[PDB]
Structure 1
């Protein structure tokens, strides 16, 4: 679906510097221009397409997708992507054992929900100023952490990831659980934990956005189906 030219324009073909590479990414690498590794778009594209297809399929059976990206450059974008296809996301720091330790985190989620309710639906007001402030702070904290996953209910049936090396904890958790992983994997990253590897530039913003958008579209399509 996503063309090669577009990818090139975005800056998918660019990778990291040669000294920071992983030799498990040697198949997906093409060459090294100006001492910086170039990802092979001929090998990338089909894989990407396959991944997209898989995602679509998942969506079709009413699968829950989780969008992970805690880089802070593409935190805004990932959330947007998630919301477009009304799916869940973790745009700020992944809580260690979010999925493996769901049952504890489900309590946190519940608490957050309660807080939200108190804030909005109650309309009681009349609260001690320090206490109120504290409550507000707590709410903020919760929202930041678990805002995207509050309506997830259980565990997701697939896990889309913007960087494998950065979100290794998440990936590991997924592996432990047995959730399919759809990771964007730059030359420095490790592809071994990832099920459906996508060789591409995690760092560049435009590229990331592109990666998101197609995925979102596919999810939407699946839903429609």
Structure 2
């Protein structure tokens, strides 16, 4: 991917001037009508070498965790992980996914037992209300943990949209030494990101571009 498709889908358009992070000055091209512009001429190579690092990562069977939890981007990140043989999170990043893996693993096992029970008839011999509670627990356990259910252990990499919206996963990785590749807007803090990528992390077109880039390139890595 390149400057053209970024500038066409709405990558370059940033957040307002009163919200930039002074650590985002060098990647800023300029300003217009009190909204910033992200310098694509820097965005393209850093992003593509992050894609190169990730392509190398999937070739060593390193599992990637897709991290995007905005309401209008849950289906985009889930599809990108669905079409990629990966693990993902698109609802509220629980405090303790990564640093507290020992206890979240128990709720993952609980979701596994409920998912066996869901396609099993187990909720017939119960009194129609305990079974309903089981179904609601299944619903919420799918909503939250249904993207990392088969992970089985800690991951090796992270891909993030709006590093500050998901700063908890960034900090959890930095607690555990998981390298992170995060779409870092002007309003984002990159001090916790190893491979950073400027670009509009809200515009659905730009976001699905970054997502398709990483998904296709991980597909390429697993092709090898």
Same fold (TM over 0.5): yes
Q: CA deviation at 1:204?
A: 0.5
Q: Name the SS of the counterpart of 2:30 in structure 1.
A: strand
Cα distance in 1 for partners of 2:56, 2:195 equals 14
Q: CA deviation at 1:70?
A: 0.9
Give the unaligned 5+ runs of structure 2. none
Q: CA deviation at 1:119?
A: 1.1
1:110-133 deviation digits (Å, cap 9, x = unpaired): 000001001114566222111111
Cα distance in 2 for partners of 1:168, 1:201 equals 17
Q: CA deviation at 1:211?
A: 0.5
Cα distance in 1 for partners of 2:76, 2:96 equals 24
Q: Name the SS of the counterpart of 1:218 in structure 2.
A: helix
1:190-210 deviation digits (Å, cap 9, x = unpaired): 010011000111110111001
Cα distance in 2 for partners of 1:165, 1:44 equals 19
Check whether the contact 2:184–2:197 (CA below 8 A) recurs between aligned residues: yes
Deviates more, 1:121-130 or 1:67-76: 121-130
Check whether the contact 2:14–2:36 (CA below 8 A) recurs between aligned residues: yes
Q: CA deviation at 1:94?
A: 0.3
**CA-atom RMSD in angstroms:** 0.9
Q: Name the SS of the counterpart of 2:178 in structure 1.
A: coil
1:163-183 deviation digits (Å, cap 9, x = unpaired): 101000000000110001000
Q: CA deviation at 1:162?
A: 1.0
Question: Which runs of structure 1 show a deviation greater than 6 angstroms over 4 or more consecutive aligned residues?
Answer: none
Aligned residues: 224
Cα distance in 1 for partners of 2:131, 2:120 equals 16
Residue 217, structure 1, aligned to residue 208, structure 2: no
Check whether the contact 2:181–2:197 (CA below 8 A) recurs between aligned residues: yes
Q: Name the SS of the counterpart of 2:209 in structure 1.
A: helix
Check whether the contact 2:123–2:131 (CA below 8 A) recurs between aligned residues: no
Cα distance in 2 for partners of 1:171, 1:197 equals 12
State the TM-score, normalizing by the size of structure 2.
Answer: 0.98
